[PDB]
Every structure is written in structure tokens, then in C-alpha cells.
Amino acid sequence: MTARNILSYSYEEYVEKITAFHGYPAPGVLIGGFMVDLAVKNLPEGILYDAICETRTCLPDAVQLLTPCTFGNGWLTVLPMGLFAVSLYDKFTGEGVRVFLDVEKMGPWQEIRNWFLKLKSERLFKEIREAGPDILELRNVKLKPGFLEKKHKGKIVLCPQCREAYPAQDGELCLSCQGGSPYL
Amino acid sequence: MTARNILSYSYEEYVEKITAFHGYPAPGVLIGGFMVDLAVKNLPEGILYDAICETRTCLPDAVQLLTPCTFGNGWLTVLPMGLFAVSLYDKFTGEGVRVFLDVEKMGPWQEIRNWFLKLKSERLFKEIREAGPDILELRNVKLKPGFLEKKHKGKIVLCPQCREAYPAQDGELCLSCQGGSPYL
Ligand SMILES: [Cl-]
Ligand SMILES: [Cl-]
Ligand SMILES: [Zn+2]
Ligand SMILES: [Zn+2]
């Protein structure tokens, strides 16, 4: 029954939007909402930010649903490191904020803890909403130089093997024909 | 002025949705719409499919906007191989369809060709809509075994260095502390 807006959305509006997009109101994307909300609230007002998720699970959809950063526009980067953390950072300077879960704060919340630590769901969902940002920690960060590199003006050539267009830098065949092909 | 629906959307509804999500009605996401539409139209009726994009640029947002597959639910995989191609495949069997651009078909469309090949925009946008799926080719594919693997029931441990939770398989530190950290 606790009032828990996520950016401009009510918690119920946010649950609606995320089930629509992600397919299920997954704990990770719900918690993810609180994280992105706290992160945005701790950036300077009106700035243009990029995003980094340190896990591929759930958290990217919280970012995509709530921020202008998407996987397809490149403003969201996903580093698959298995860490339930997101950073939002100034695109010009690389200064930003990282938000992650603080298990030290999940005393009052054993369902969130059992979920987070995969220890072996109506109760879980109520807890996420009650906890809100109380299970989160924030830290100022600055991105490494490589994350703010000029993107390269690549020359497009034709792969002799599959006859598709690809960046010439990738080699004498495209990366698929080199062995990256997922297909039999 | 050509009628060009993209799944359930009109071309104008689709342009609206994609500018909202992606930030700009980028040629890639527009073309991407035609691709995902042709792909879905060539899967058996009513089946549950996963998606693969072979480039990170634009094409993922066409998939995310039009299909239930998202980066965060794991039903969309992005293989960053620089190839403007998407496949949709049966999640159970791995049989699917790959769609890509056929430059052989871009005779009537020099603006699309100049864009696709990066050779050095009101005209480009009109052409994409006029061309529709005429610049696309389709091929039946079956995914390699590794893309249909059972996902591992990982044990969650605490990184001694950063004291965040991570999968024990990753090592004695988490992948960030091992060196994957994007932060200074
Ligand atoms: Cl991950
Ligand atoms: Cl790529
Ligand atoms: Zn090739
Ligand atoms: Zn660590």
C-alpha cells in the first residue's frame, strides 16, 4: 500500500509498463526501477547521460523503459559481469553514479534476500515495493577512457564468402564467416 | 504515400513508436521494422520465438519494439558482428529465418545504398518507405547447439574485494574486480 513512484510513473503504472515490455513483472526489473530512479535523482539537473548495466538479466529493461538510453541507440552498454548494478553517467565527462543492492540493508526483507542470493512470491513482490530504495547503495564513479572513445568512421566492404556488407576492420571475412556464425 | 504496415502498426504509427523509444527515426530501425515484419510472417503461426541481431546498431530496437524479445528477458541475443541481419527462431527447435539486406535489390534506391555502404536525408526516408521489404532477402536457418543450452543454476557468492554478490563460477573475485570494471 506504500506510495512509490518511479520517475514520472506510479509503482502500478511502472509495473504495467514493465510487464508489457519485459513479459512478466520480474523482481529484477521492479528493483531496477528503484535503482534507475535513485540514479537519475543523483545526476545534475537536465544533463545528457549514458547508462551501463553490469548484468544482462532484467536490469537492462528498467533502463530501456525509463531512460532514453537503449541497447539499439548505443547509449546503453551492457557489461555482462553478473553484478546487479547500473551506472548513469555524463556523456561528455564520464562522471556519474553507480547504484547497486546493499545486502547489509536486507534484514527486514528475507524474501528479497532469498531471491537475490538464490537461496532454496506474493510475499517477494510486496517486499520489493515496501523496501523501495532502502535496499540500495549509491557511489560516485568516473568511467575509464575507453568508454568515452570516438567511435570509428569504418569503411564498408563485401564479405567474399557470404556476400554481405561488413566493416573492413573486422578482417578478410566478416566475423560471422570467421566463426561467429550462430547458424549450422 | 505507399501503405506499409509493420506487424499491427501503420508505417506512421511505427515511426512514432520508434522515435519515442530510440530517440530518432533512424533508417536502421525503420528498415529493421520491415525485416522483423518479414521474419515474423515466415515463422509458423502462433509459435514462441527467440531473436538474434548480428549488429548492435539500431536493429535491436526494432526487435524490442515489435516482438516480446528484449535484451533484458534474454529472448533477444545480440552478436556484435557488424552484419545488418536478424533471425527469429523457434525456442524449442532452433529452426528459424534470417533476414538481411540484399544490395543486389538496391538499384532503384541509391540513397538507401549510400546509407548502407556509408558512401560520401528527406530522400533517404522516402526511399526506405517506398522500398519496404523489396531490399530484403530471407533464408531458413537452424541455430548451433550452444544457443539452445540449458542456462546454469549458478551459486551466488560474495566478492571479497567489492563485497557484492556474483556467480561463483566467475572466479575468486567478480569479473569487475578481475578487471572488467569500467570505472576509474
Ligand atoms: Cl551478466
Ligand atoms: Cl555490431
Ligand atoms: Zn561473411
Ligand atoms: Zn568484486
Numbering used by the authors:
A (entry chain A), B (entry chain A): 1 to 120, 127 to 190
Please give the exact wording used by the authors of the publication that reports this structure.
Here, the first crystal structures from PF02663 are described, representing two bacterial and one archaeal species: B8FYU2_DESHY from the anaerobic dehalogenating bacterium Desulfito­bacterium hafniense DCB-2, Q2LQ23_SYNAS from the syntrophic bacterium Syntrophus aciditrophicus SB and Q9HJ63_THEAC from the thermoacidophilic archaeon Thermoplasma acidophilum. Two of these proteins, Q9HJ63_THEAC and Q2LQ23_SYNAS, contain two domains: an N-terminal thioredoxin-like α+β core domain (NTD) consisting of a five-stranded, mixed β-sheet flanked by several α-helices and a C-terminal zinc-finger domain (CTD). The proximity of fmdE to genes encoding the catalytic subunits suggests a role in methanogenesis for proteins in PF02663. Individual proteins within this family display differences in domain architectures, metal-ion binding propensities and dimer interactions.
